[PDB]
C-alpha cells in the first residue's frame, strides 16, 4: 500500500512521479514530403544508362 504523507518529506515532493513528455504534439507535420511543383516533377529523361 502506498504512503499518503510524502508531501512533508523533501524527497517525496521532489520525487513524486508524473508521466513523460513526447515533444511534438500530434498536429506537427513535415512539409518535406509534399508533392513537388510540376516544373520539377518532370520525367526521367535517361531510361537505360547501361
Amino acid at each position: 500500500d502506498r504512503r499518503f504523507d510524502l508531501h512533508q518529506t523533501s524527497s517525496g515532493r521532489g520525487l513524486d512521479y508524473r508521466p513523460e513528455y513526447y515533444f511534438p504534439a500530434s498536429d506537427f507535420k513535415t512539409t518535406i514530403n509534399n508533392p513537388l511543383p510540376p516544373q520539377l516533377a518532370k520525367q526521367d529523361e535517361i531510361i537505360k544508362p547501361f
Binding site: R13, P24, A25, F28, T30, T31, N34, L40, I46
Partner: protein
C-alpha cells in the same frame, strides 16, 4: 552528332531537375526546423512555467 547532342542535353536537364529538387527539399527542411523551434518555444511556454515546478 545530333544523337550525341541530345544525350548530353538529356543528362544536363536531368541534373538540373535533380539539384532544383534538392534545393527545394533543403528549404523545406529549413522551414521544418523553423516550425520545430516554434513548437519547442510553445511547449516551453505551456509546460515549463515556474509555478508548475515541484
Amino acid at each position: 552528332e545530333q544523337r550525341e547532342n541530345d544525350r548530353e542535353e538529356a543528362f544536363a536537364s536531368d541534373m538540373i531537375r535533380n539539384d532544383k529538387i534538392s534545393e527545394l527539399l533543403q528549404r523545406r527542411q529549413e522551414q521544418d526546423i523553423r516550425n520545430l523551434n516554434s513548437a519547442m518555444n510553445e511547449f516551453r511556454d505551456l509546460h515549463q512555467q515556474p509555478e508548475g515546478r515541484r
